[model samples]
Target chain A: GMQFHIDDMTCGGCASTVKKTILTLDANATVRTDPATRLVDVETSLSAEQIAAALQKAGFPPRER
Target chain B: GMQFHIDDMTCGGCASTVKKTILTLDANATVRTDPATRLVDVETSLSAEQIAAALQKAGFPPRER
Candidate 1:
């Protein structure tokens, strides 16, 4: 599992977009978003760098967790 | 110049955010957005893969053109 602080995930749509992006990359990936804290927790086969890269590609850059 | 069709970039705010994210990576990069067509044209030192990656990170996944 990895945690990411994505400051731009401000609303339900942003959170949904992030979740969809991860699932698109890894259908089996588990994702949970906390809009209040602007955090995302993910479990997947991708490395931390890979996961971060995916999120970055989706327009929600993540800070180191 | 690289052209991408980003389906989720719905409004001006989305375009601005995407532009900012790319500029953050390469300050000299040029970005032009067409919300009318959901298209983005970018001129930068970054590779297509890199540009696509950055957009995806920013929550605007791009389709190859």
Candidate 2:
């Protein structure tokens, strides 16, 4: 599991986008988010770098957490 | 208008994510992508900095084009 802080996530829609993007990479992956802190917690087989890369591509670049 | 070269866009799904992310920022924005080149062209009111920042957050950091 990994945690990412993403500043651009401001609503449920943003959180949905983040989840969708990660799911594209690993359909079986588990994703959880806290819109309050703009943080995302993910459990997947994908590497951290891969997840970060995907998040950036999905439009919610992960900040240092 | 701005063009960004993204290194990880390998398929139509990636293209869709890029388009969706930009549309979220500017509903009227037009987005075009070349999977082979991994370049994305966008037309929108958002500034280059804003676009790039969004792209990076989305998970496809743009390289100088």
Candidate 3:
């Protein structure tokens, strides 16, 4: 299932940080972030919990389920 | 081949006139009138001349090839 990964990305730095954090967990993880709506649409096989875990480990509390 | 029927439709009245004209020529004809660009996409078994005649009868000259 492809979940709509919406993150509160405000700027380029926020986008980069989110991308880096997600890639750290899965090297093949692809993240397409749009700063316009601060939304990042990501396609991955990992569960939402796993993604949250990755974000938490990186010091960013990503809220998505 | 289905032709692109573009007319100089300016309002809802123009849309109605075009739709009615096309329908009158071929009762089974499908006409989708878009006032945004004054375009009517029609699907019918009748010839373009028949459609033009219908429009001309209704005082609206249809432009389709």
Query: Quality of candidate 3's docking, in CAPRI categories?
Result: incorrect
Clashes in predicted model 3 = 0
Query: What CAPRI-style quality would you assign to candidate 2?
Result: incorrect
- Taken over the whole model, the C-alpha lDDT of each candidate is 0.76, 0.76, 0.61
Specify the poorest-scoring 10-residue window by lDDT in model 2 chain A: A26-35
lDDT of 2 by residue, B1-65 (tens): 48888887777567667766776887555556666788888767789889889889989788745
The candidate that wins on DockQ is 2
Could you give candidate 3's per-residue lDDT for residues B1-65 as a string of tens digits? 34445566676556655665665556556565666776667667787777777777776776774
Cα lDDT tens digits for candidate 1, A1-65: 58999999886567767766776676556566776899988777788898889899989999858
Q: What is the lDDT of residue B57 in candidate 2?
A: 96
lDDT of each residue in B1-65, candidate 1, tens digit only: 58999899886556656665765676556566666788888767789999999889888999968
lDDT per residue as tens, model 2, A1-65 = 58999999887578767866876787556566666888888767879899999899878899746
